[PDB]
Design a binder for this molecule. Sequence first.
Ligand SMILES: Cc1cc2nc3c(=O)[nH]c(=O)nc-3n(C[C@H](O)[C@H](O)[C@H](O)COP(=O)(O)OP(=O)(O)OC[C@H]3O[C@@H](n4cnc5c(N)ncnc54)[C@H](O)[C@@H]3O)c2cc1C
Ligand SMILES: Cc1cc2nc3c(=O)[nH]c(=O)nc-3n(C[C@H](O)[C@H](O)[C@H](O)COP(=O)(O)OP(=O)(O)OC[C@H]3O[C@@H](n4cnc5c(N)ncnc54)[C@H](O)[C@@H]3O)c2cc1C
Lengths: 52, 188, 971, 63
Amino acid sequence: IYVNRNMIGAVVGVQPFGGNGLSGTGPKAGGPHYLARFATEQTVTINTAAAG
Amino acid sequence: KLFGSETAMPGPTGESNALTMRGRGVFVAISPWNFPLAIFLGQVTAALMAGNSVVAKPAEQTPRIAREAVALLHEAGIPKSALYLVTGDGRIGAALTAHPDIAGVVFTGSTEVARSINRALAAKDGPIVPLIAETGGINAMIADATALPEQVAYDVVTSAFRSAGQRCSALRLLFVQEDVADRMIEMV
Amino acid sequence: NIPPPFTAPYAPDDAEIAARLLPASHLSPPQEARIHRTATRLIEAIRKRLGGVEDMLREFALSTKEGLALMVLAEALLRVPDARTADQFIEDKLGEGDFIHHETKSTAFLVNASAWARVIQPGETPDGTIGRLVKRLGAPAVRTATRQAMRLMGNHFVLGETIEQALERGKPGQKTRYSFDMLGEGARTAADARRYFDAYASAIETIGKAAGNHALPDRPGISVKLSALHPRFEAISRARVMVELVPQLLDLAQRAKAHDLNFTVDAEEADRLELSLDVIAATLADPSLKGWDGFGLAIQAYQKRASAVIDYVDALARAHDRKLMVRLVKGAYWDTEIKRAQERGLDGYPVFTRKAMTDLNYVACASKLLALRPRIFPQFATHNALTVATVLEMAEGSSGFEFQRLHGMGEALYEQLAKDHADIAYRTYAPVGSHRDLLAYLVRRLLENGANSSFVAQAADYRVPVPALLQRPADAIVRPQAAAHPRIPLPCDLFAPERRNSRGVEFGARTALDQLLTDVKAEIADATPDQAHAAVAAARAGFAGWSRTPAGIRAAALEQAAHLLESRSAHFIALLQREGGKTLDDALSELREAADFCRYYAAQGRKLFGSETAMPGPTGESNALTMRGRGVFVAISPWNFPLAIFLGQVTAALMAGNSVVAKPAEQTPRIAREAVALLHEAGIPKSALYLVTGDGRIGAALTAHPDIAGVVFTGSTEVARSINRALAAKDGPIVPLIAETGGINAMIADATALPEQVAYDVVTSAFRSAGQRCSALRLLFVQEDVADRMIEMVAGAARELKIGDPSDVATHVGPVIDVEAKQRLDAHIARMKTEARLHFAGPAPEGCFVAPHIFELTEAGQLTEEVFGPILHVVRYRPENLERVLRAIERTGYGLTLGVHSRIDDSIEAIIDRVQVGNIYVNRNMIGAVVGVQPFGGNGLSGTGPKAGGPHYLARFATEQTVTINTAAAG
Amino acid sequence: AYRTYAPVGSHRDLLAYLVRRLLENGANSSFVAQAADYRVPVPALLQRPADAIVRPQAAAHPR
Ligand SMILES: Cc1cc2nc3c(=O)[nH]c(=O)nc-3n(C[C@H](O)[C@H](O)[C@H](O)COP(=O)(O)OP(=O)(O)OC[C@H]3O[C@@H](n4cnc5c(N)ncnc54)[C@H](O)[C@@H]3O)c2cc1C
Ligand SMILES: Cc1cc2nc3c(=O)[nH]c(=O)nc-3n(C[C@H](O)[C@H](O)[C@H](O)COP(=O)(O)OP(=O)(O)OC[C@H]3O[C@@H](n4cnc5c(N)ncnc54)[C@H](O)[C@@H]3O)c2cc1C
């Protein structure tokens, strides 16, 4: 949403760009939720008691 | 920030728990003609950064800028084995996305093509992979009678006609209050 | 009158205890002056300075793991028939290479003597515990440390391949100079419990033939552990324990009595205290033990119940008119007790959390025991010079008690005491047993010697001034309110201040278990396709308002749901047992997890949706990023966690600002309905949450509905694909699909792994909840050198599982969900019987039950399907072929959980680097993922992500919005 | 080839010599002191001096 200015030229890291509905899936390019979608999470759980 | 170090999780004594994020596999990156360098590079560098190798098919109208961007990434330190450029039509794009070994698709282009990519992915008996699709818009602007007509006109002309309107963000539909309608339209 | 079954409050307040112990600890200045002098002299003797384990750890700056590795290597090297062969190995081979091979072979030697009996290429990358040690210290120092470990293993331990070999080795017409601390503990199989019984019986005869001609207490003793004598020694199996174990313990007591020996029942974990006292009381009660003063037990001063145990033992002694020998110790399982109370969400710790509190309680308990002479003969087991000096002073004169130490500890301490006070008696114990029981004993011992708080460790460190060792415990505590350790939170505060932790129950406390069993015992038409469509439309109408309800109010609603869940835990636990067929621990755990989901998503919800994120940019412009609800989410949940996964998915979607239409598994709609009613009562509007029950056709109507904004799904891989296809066929928006599906989960156990622990964790991972967990172990890979022992131990342990009615507290394995499931399982069993070796097939009760089964495959590729039941598959492998194991795990295409059991960090790390599995568990079981601790969920055929119970979950239920305002006209 | 020296002299000259010698053996920076301390990993003793300084402006001791 752009208020009292034009609607174009989204700046990377300033206006994370991208929409919903028929406009896209997300996440927004140039924003902080983008990179995670390209990755998978991994939890490593180690029982450390024999060491202290 | 995201992949540079693990996130420690709180838990009981005598046990460690760490959350990490790793690459998924092979990403297919499909880019449009209207931002042939920046969207091409945005999608590709994101996938690479996340630890994925990338097969990139640029829009048929703009392969040369894509080839140069690819060579530039290789020279910037991206291994030849991590990044490949495949040029061609939509059937080639369909070949890459229907390939059973890829780990995800990042797509920017038409809504119709995104749906067919999504259908080709879902048809596979393999893993359900991520689809990142940024498609079009029918973008509105609402201008009320408190708005400055000289500024509305300028921002409307810019939003609609910059780049011959060949931007996904471009203004397509202007709503203007009737009391100021004649003046604003005439000025645009 | 015989005392009632022991029941003391499990974890009372530390401060109230300190308020009584602090003043009673007061001693007159001449009393303190005498203690100070005796202790100074004992400590100075210790600092005179071959020594002990603490010295080896200190001298080479060894971790506990490294000490363990060298002692194991040392023991193998000592049992080579020709000592010159050992010398050649140490100089030529050790430190030059084959580091992992040496670590693996010497550890395997302990269960498989034949395994241990190449040419080492130069420039080998130093990996493994020994390799890393060599890199840090250098090969020659490692050789020097190994020889020292050889002296320690040879001098301070009585060991053999069998008990007869150990007993022969430790032989003195002389009397034995030491009593026997028998190695065994925690039998996993019936065969193990008999072997330990036999070893105890053999030891009693060996020690009896060399017991000398004096009267008690001047005769040797033997220490015995109840967990070694019974393979399911636990409160829930009490009925069978009283019936099977008591006669065994009695048999041994009688054999000890016939040689007039000291016979001591060791004290183990806090959750076994009450059960051990029941066993000991019933055993002591037997008339055959009259006329003998050598029977006794250990009492741990680190426990708040310690004083009450002393009263109980004394009343037991008077009721039966016996004399007892009672060992007072501090306690060997402190770290274990902390960990457990935390995992189990107990309301406090059974032990003190400041070391000085244990020291105080020890002296108070000793004072109490001294006053119970001569009926009770106290034995003060400690290597603390100050504790010895203080107990000696309190005795004011002496006799009617003794001190106790472990061979290889407190030698100089007790020699000096005997010089300075000739009528002081002290008993010395030597560890005696088989190599197969060494590892478990060594680990515990190395934790005490390596501990920074250890008195023995400090007295040997010349950086620690003698006067620091003499600080009186009361002066360390100073004030009652400081009794609890400031840096150790109560389990309820484990996640503070981020969120509250759910409450658990300690089954080892009979008051708590009986109350829980009592409370629990005291406690649906389908939908038409039209009804499901109306539910969607209704949820669609409720979306606008709910999405705009402030995040803190949505969060308050989840938190109230958690509170109502815990307040009504008995009600929901009853439902989990009746509808889900879950055993009590599984039901309780599911209830905790459900509450945990509500609190964690609430807390992550405020963080993520509580306020906008400001984005940096030019002046004269603001840029704010927000996350809003998507629309109507369809939540489809499975039968195996019918409350927690159902609630996790639903409360997540709700928290993100979505309205929800929820379709629960056909087998478990009732718990779902109650959960829904509960969320509504917690503050979730009727218009935001709807329950639609029915089959997959109803589930399919919901997912094909053109107006929904997303699907969250947990279930079968095939159903997830058909949902994905139904969504992708739509001409509408591409909506998010979150799908957590199955796994074919592997465990890799190498020859450095402890078989008793592997067996326990394998049996748990594969057979808990009748294998009806998505994280369950299906495929065990075990190195060939330890395969026979490991498989045998797993099979023997599986046989001890009680299969039956999940409402009986003694049951370990309940029924499978329905006949359709049982049938599918039985077909796979019939197939595997014709296809693979059957190692174990248990006896199912009549009804919808499948018993644990263990099959060995020739290759992993013979297991091609997730089999959703208590059915373990085993593949043995050669150490050089680890890649083929890893390749076989990749081949399935699944990636949910993976277990790794190994001592070797480089091996563990290589496995982690290689595999893509969502949850890797190292040296523990693979189940019971805790919300916010183990973000759970996999990749490949196992799921889409993001992980449930983790920090990337909520975002996916939302969509982002950037608002960009040109602010220049304001300034 | 390596030459080995032994300290030779009268008791009346020992104290002054001993003080200086004990300052070198007791110094935390001493290589001999570190190589004898098993807490110090062999690789730490092998850090190249140029890698400790890294940059000219860091030549002087900051403290
Ligand atoms: C012959 C013999 C038999 C034994 N049998 C048993 C047995 O059957 N069962 C058993 O549990 N123990 C038993 N022990 C005791 C155990 O093995 C340790 O030796 C003992 O706890 C050490 O106490 P201490 O006076 O030697 O040493 P210290 O260094 O004085 O005391 C150490 C002890 O303090 C306690 N401690 C450490 N940190 C904390 C803390 N933060 N808060 C509260 N307390 C803390 C622990 O119990 C620890 O062991 C036995 C010991 C001997 C010598
Ligand atoms: C046979 C023999 C004869 C010697 N004769 C003399 C002599 O005639 N005159 C003399 O001055 N020395 C003399 N020395 C050297 C002195 O006695 C020390 O032995 C020597 O400096 C140690 O250096 P290193 O390579 O052994 O040890 P290292 O542990 O490598 O180096 C220690 C040296 O580093 C230097 N150093 C320590 N801290 C700092 C710092 N913050 N900044 C800069 N430098 C620092 C000091 O010089 C210190 O001695 C002699 C040594 C030997 C073996």
